[PDB]
Write an enzyme that holds these catalytic residues in place. Sequence first.
Site, PDB file in Angstrom:
ATOM      1  N   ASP A  64      46.240  37.670  39.787  1.00 28.38           N
ATOM      2  CA  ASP A  64      45.921  38.468  38.615  1.00 28.38           C
ATOM      3  C   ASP A  64      45.683  37.507  37.454  1.00 28.38           C
ATOM      4  O   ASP A  64      44.597  37.532  36.869  1.00 28.38           O
ATOM      5  CB  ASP A  64      47.061  39.480  38.333  1.00 28.38           C
ATOM      6  N   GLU A  80      48.875  52.403  35.489  1.00 31.94           N
ATOM      7  CA  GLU A  80      48.765  52.444  34.030  1.00 31.94           C
ATOM      8  C   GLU A  80      47.428  52.955  33.527  1.00 31.94           C
ATOM      9  O   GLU A  80      46.394  52.323  33.769  1.00 31.94           O
ATOM     10  CB  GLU A  80      49.047  51.063  33.443  1.00 31.94           C
ATOM     11  N   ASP A  81      47.465  54.082  32.784  1.00 32.52           N
ATOM     12  CA  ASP A  81      46.312  54.764  32.164  1.00 32.52           C
ATOM     13  C   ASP A  81      45.328  55.361  33.173  1.00 32.52           C
ATOM     14  O   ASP A  81      44.192  55.664  32.793  1.00 32.52           O
ATOM     15  CB  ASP A  81      45.561  53.854  31.151  1.00 32.52           C
ATOM     16  N   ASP A 128      40.212   6.397  40.547  1.00 27.46           N
ATOM     17  CA  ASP A 128      39.600   7.577  41.146  1.00 27.46           C
ATOM     18  C   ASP A 128      39.596   7.412  42.668  1.00 27.46           C
ATOM     19  O   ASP A 128      38.607   6.932  43.238  1.00 27.46           O
ATOM     20  CB  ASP A 128      38.168   7.768  40.578  1.00 27.46           C
ATOM     21  N   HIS A 132      46.909  47.033  41.900  1.00 35.94           N
ATOM     22  CA  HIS A 132      47.922  46.461  41.002  1.00 35.94           C
ATOM     23  C   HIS A 132      47.890  46.975  39.560  1.00 35.94           C
ATOM     24  O   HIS A 132      48.848  46.708  38.832  1.00 35.94           O
ATOM     25  CB  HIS A 132      47.863  44.923  41.020  1.00 35.94           C
ATOM     26  N   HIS A 188      37.791  43.697  37.957  1.00 35.34           N
ATOM     27  CA  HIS A 188      39.038  42.930  37.945  1.00 35.34           C
ATOM     28  C   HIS A 188      39.884  43.128  39.229  1.00 35.34           C
ATOM     29  O   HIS A 188      40.124  42.121  39.885  1.00 35.34           O
ATOM     30  CB  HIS A 188      39.858  43.188  36.666  1.00 35.34           C
TER      31      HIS A 188
END
Length: 350
Positions: A141, A75-76, A267, A71, A47
């Site tokens: 993200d 956290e953890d 189109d 980023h 990720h």
Amino acid sequence: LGLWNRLEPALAYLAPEERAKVREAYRFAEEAHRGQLRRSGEPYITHPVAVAEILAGLQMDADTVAAGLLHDTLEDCGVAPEELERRFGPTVRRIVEGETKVSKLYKLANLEGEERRAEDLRQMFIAMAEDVRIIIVKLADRLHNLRTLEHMPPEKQKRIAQETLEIYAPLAHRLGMGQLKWELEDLSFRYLHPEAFASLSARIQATQEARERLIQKAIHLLQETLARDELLQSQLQGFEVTGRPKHLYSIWKKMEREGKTLEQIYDLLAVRVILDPKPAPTRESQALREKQVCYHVLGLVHALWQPIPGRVKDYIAVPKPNGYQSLHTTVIALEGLPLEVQIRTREMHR
Ligand SMILES: Nc1nc2c(ncn2[C@@H]2O[C@H](COP(=O)(O)OP(=O)(O)O)[C@@H](OP(=O)(O)OP(=O)(O)O)[C@H]2O)c(=O)[nH]1
Ligand SMILES: [Cl-]
Ligand SMILES: [Mg+2]
Ligand SMILES: [Mn+2]
């Protein structure tokens, strides 16, 4: 093990010392997310690498792509913001804390159901993130998050899609990041209105074979013309000639609001020209070159295909309110067909 060797090529636009910071950042992340997994079964490191990859495609500040790898380390992972400032400086720290802090802040925020709700929430991010890079990384993200939304419950799939459509896709627009704005919309549409998406997608994939056959004639033809021009090539490092992908959410949005069917909506074929200017001795030399090379191409496009009167649009000279820059021209090609050509540099491509 394919990670990094995948990313590295995309970092070619950065100075060696900058790439060095990005390797240090990746390795640090690789450690922080060691043993962690995604709800996909993949190691977590996939990720932030994907987010960093997106930002490098968007040709972002080195501190920004490094922040892309970092980023989620706060956290953890047992990482304190003090460690990120100590090792990667205050800008990388500012951005990672910024992207982390906002996600929680939006969770707290109560505007659900109230008229013009998104507008007041969008302005909340605008008002707090003075450094837009925070927002860019948050967009990168949410982009990768939506790309991997199949590994999430249909409750989360619908919650994320709506949020992106109310918050992040309009923010991508405000920041003049159309490539992102498009992707976010079409992906949100997929997961938010599946039955309506699968219907529209199959209706296009019915004529898609014949359309890109025609689009490739134009691409090949315009490519050879540019490559044969000695003077343009001298001021150029590289170029890309590609078709504009159909904005399925924008197609369907119109199709409901003003009625009609996909066959009823015209189109208009479009082709994009991304130009990579050769590195010029000065910042002024490079700036003048950036414009010079785009008008050079406009001329070549008219020399190749008959221009439709009044269809020249100069957004380099007069950028759109969201800063959008490009050269637009509607020409006749493919034995009598209207084709739109968008001429821009790599910097202009957002
Ligand atoms: N799409 C996707 N997400 C996954 C996957 N595995 C884990 N996640 C996590 O899910 C979070 C997003 O939605 P939630 O399920 O509500 O996680 P949350 O309770 O912490 O908010 C993401 O963190 P986030 O960066 O803070 O995104 P977000 O919370 O701002 O939505 C992401 O890291 C996966 O395979 N696909
Ligand atoms: Cl597009
Ligand atoms: Mg997200
Ligand atoms: Mn994340």
